[PDB]
Amino acid sequence: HHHVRVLAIRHVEIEDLGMMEDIFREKNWSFDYLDTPKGEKLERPLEEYSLVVLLGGYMGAYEEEKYPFLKYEFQLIEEILKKEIPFLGICLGSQMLAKVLGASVYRGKNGEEIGWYFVEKVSDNKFFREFPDRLRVFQWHGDTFDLPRRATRVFTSEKYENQGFVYGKAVGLQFHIEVGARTMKRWIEAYKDELEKKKIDPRLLLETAEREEKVLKGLLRSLLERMVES
């Protein structure tokens, strides 16, 4: 029953642990960011980590030639599955996990999801036992994936059949439950021109983040506790 250290694999500086950082701090969990686009490699063996989180980003899952750091990340995922270390992939992270498990990743044919949307829970999987049947979550994605053969679908949606899945101790979520109001403010500033181009009202994204953040943080805490539980 070791003290928890988390590996946080980050593709975009702004797209960070969000409210997971607050939770890790609350629980005195250690964490290391691994910023692979900066050329960073593991500072410790994978066995020193109790949980690995693979965060989102705009890179495509098949774009290893453009983004050579992804090749290293895919190698880590393979090792993480073999060693059965708890793993949480979010957004791009979920798509990279799906790919490693043999599923195609591709552009969504029902438009991008940028903003606040419902997902529905379609499994009694223990990691998500505290989650409700229908949950408002934050989305920022244009790609989706097929459900890997060995995986259990845990979340679906009206636009995208595959919103979240579990395979062993590895979890993939297309959506964000870690973006609260403080993190949202950073994202809307970072992506202000994209939001303007797409005519998406940042005031409403933030107001919804303020309304949802307490419920989402509580669910995120439950998820994390269950994933690392010994």
Distance CA 215, CA 208 (A): 12
Dihedral of alpha carbons 25, 225, 148, 134, sign? negative
Under 8 Å between Cβ of 88 and 227: yes
Phi, psi of 137 (to 5 degrees): -135, 165
How many Å is the maximal CA-CA distance in the chain? 50
Q: Which domain holds residue 71?
A: 1-230
Distance, CA of 85 to CA of 65 (rounded, Å): 28
CA–CA dist 30, 16 (Å, integer): 15
CA angle, 124 as apex, 219 and 107 as ends, to 5°?
A: 75
Three-state secondary structure call for residue 192 = helix
Work out the burial of residue 113: count CB atoms within 10 Å of its CB; fewer than 13 is exposed, 13-18 middle, 19 or more buried: buried
**Any alpha helices (H) in the chain, and if so which ranges?**
19-26, 69-82, 92-100, 181-190, 192-197, 202-228
Tokens of 156: 């679906």
- With contact defined as beta carbons under 8 Å apart, do 183 and 18 qualify? yes
Q: Is 74 exposed, middle or buried (0-12, 13-18, 19+ CB in 10 A)?
A: middle
Determine the straight-line distance between the first and last CA of the chain, rounded to whole angstroms. Answer: 6
Dihedral angle, C-alpha 16, 170, 113, 37, nearest 10 °: 40
Secondary structure (DSSP) of 11-40: SSTTSS-THHHHHHHHTT-EEEEE-GGGT-
Distance CA 193, CA 25 (A): 32
Tokens of 89: 């992939």
With 0-12 / 13-18 / 19 or more C-beta atoms within 10 angstroms meaning exposed / middle / buried, residue 71 is exposed
- What is the rounded CA–CA span in Å between residue 214 and residue 192? 25
CATH number, domain with residue 96: 3.40.50.880
For 69, phi then psi, to 5°, come to -55, -25
Question: By what method was this entry solved?
Answer: X-ray
Q: Which residue has the tokens 């599923």?
A: 103
- Strand ranges (E), 100-175: 105-107, 113-121, 134-141, 143-145, 152-156, 164-167, 170-173
- For the record, the structure tokens of 52 come out as 């690995």
Q: State how many domains the chain has.
A: 1
